Amino acid sequence: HPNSAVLADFIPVQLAKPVPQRITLELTAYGFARAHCLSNGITDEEGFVQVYKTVKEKFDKYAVSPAQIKQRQLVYFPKLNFDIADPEPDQAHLRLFDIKKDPRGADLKTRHESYAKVVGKGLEQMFEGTLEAPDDLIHVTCSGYLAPSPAERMVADRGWFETTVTHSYNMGCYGAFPAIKMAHGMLASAQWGATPPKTRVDIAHTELMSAHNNIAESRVDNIISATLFSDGLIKYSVYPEDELRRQGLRGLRILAMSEHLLPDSADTMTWVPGSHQFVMTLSPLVPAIIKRHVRAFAVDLLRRAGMDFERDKDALSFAIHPGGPKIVDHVQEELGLAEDQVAISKSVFLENGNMSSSTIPHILKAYLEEATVGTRIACLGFGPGLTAAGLVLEKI
């Protein structure tokens, strides 16, 4: 196919062994209780006891449970009353919370320097099988912003002095979509002649959601986000389809893409850097707003691909970003989807939690590695805005 871009070769890197959810919940609950006691001058044991019981009750009620998420990769959760060891200065940098003295923990500068170090290493592992520089490298993240970025430093470390680096930043849980949109555009811009020809764009996701741990705030939506979000680093490539074929690779051919905002929703999800970490609010209104608009969005997306929702939806897999425990279910229900059309997305959430932008790429990795050639996949995700983003893919 001329004028075609193809996703391929998806490579996750695990930086830390995933922690069983019931343990994340016990310790996070204990940390929120100590922080709270530090924050309100409660100093006596029986004081901590009553606060701890209340925090635990709150966790039982509102925390994402082990039945919903089995384990999460959390680089900044301590390595396996609790007592926490100090770590080797060998790595004070993994320790960004504080339950003895200042409950706000590390400040943002410290967290940013930590991010650069951890992602730096992650990126060197993500790209160690890469033999030739890409024409472009896109860095996607919503969890740490530095200039130059860890991506820029790695490209230089590799001596990749003809590679364009583009930051695709602050586009949250759906950040794969705009990154794939750029990549498609960089291949199309090359075919238009504005740059010499290009044969590969590499996109690298690095989300350290656990770097933004906030145990000083006890509002429900913070309990929920502390127990919901997880870390994920994953890279994949975008090839012009002729280059994909020449290299004998399997891939996901891009058919169509779409993205725009949803009305009366801007305040329902926010994410803002403050003095110590990026701070989140999340309204319980969000799944209903997604439910309300997803169908019309999906019908339009399939039309963009020359498809018809009523006639073609049954043969499609739907890769859906699992933003909360019930998001896939809601979309499943609104779109009238069978279990086997949404099974991979539920399972990635169940095994990993919400790794923010890195989630959808892990979903697409499983489709690329499991589906028959010819399979079509409609991808949907949501993030702040609120934004709806979508992609139509075909396995080739």
Residues numbered 106-125 forming contacts with its own copies, rule: CB under 8 A: 107-109, 112-113
299: CB partners within 8 A, 6+ apart: 309
**Is residue 173 part of the contact set for Na ion (CB under 5 A)?**
no
Q: At what angle do helices 359-370 and 176-192 cross, to 10 degrees?
A: 70
Q: Specify the residue, 253 or 313, whose C-beta has the smaller distance to its own copies.
A: 253
120 binds, among its own copies, Na ion, none (CB under 5 to 8 A by kind): none
**Is residue 283 part of the contact set for its own copies (CB under 8 A)?**
no
Answer for which of 263, 311, 339, 374 binds its own copies (CB under 8 A) is: 263
Facing residues of 20 across strands?
71
**Is residue 101 part of the contact set for its own copies (CB under 8 A)?**
no
Answer for which of 165, 234, 257, 393 binds Na ion (CB under 5 A) is: 165
Answer for which of 13, 99, 140, 182 binds its own copies (CB under 8 A) is: 182
Identity of residue 99: I
Contact by Cβ (8 Å): 74, 208: no
**CB burial string 178-206: b at 16+ within 10 A, e below:** bbbbbbbebbeebeeeeeeebbbbbbbbb
Distance CA 236, CA 296 (A): 29
Part of the chain binding its own copies (CB under 8 A), chosen from 84-92, 231-239, 350-358, 383-391: 383-391
Pairing of strands 376-383, 201-208: unpaired
Distance CA 113, CA 210 (A): 14
Q: Specify the residue, 22 or 109, whose C-beta has the smaller distance to its own copies.
A: 109
Query: CA angle, corner 220, sides to 380 and 173, nearest 5?
Result: 20
Answer for which of 14, 39, 65, 164 binds its own copies (CB under 8 A) is: 164
Contact by Cβ (8 Å): 381, 294: no
Q: Specify the residue, 171 or 391, whose C-beta has the smaller distance to Na ion.
A: 171
**Is residue 383 part of the contact set for its own copies (CB under 8 A)?**
yes
Q: Supply the minimum distance, in Å, between the C-beta of residue 113 and its own copies.
A: 8
- Considering only residues 123 to 152 of the shown chain, the ones binding its own copies according to CB under 8 A are 142, 145-149, 152
Site map (CB under 5 A) of Na ion, residues 333-372, x = contact: ----------------------------------------
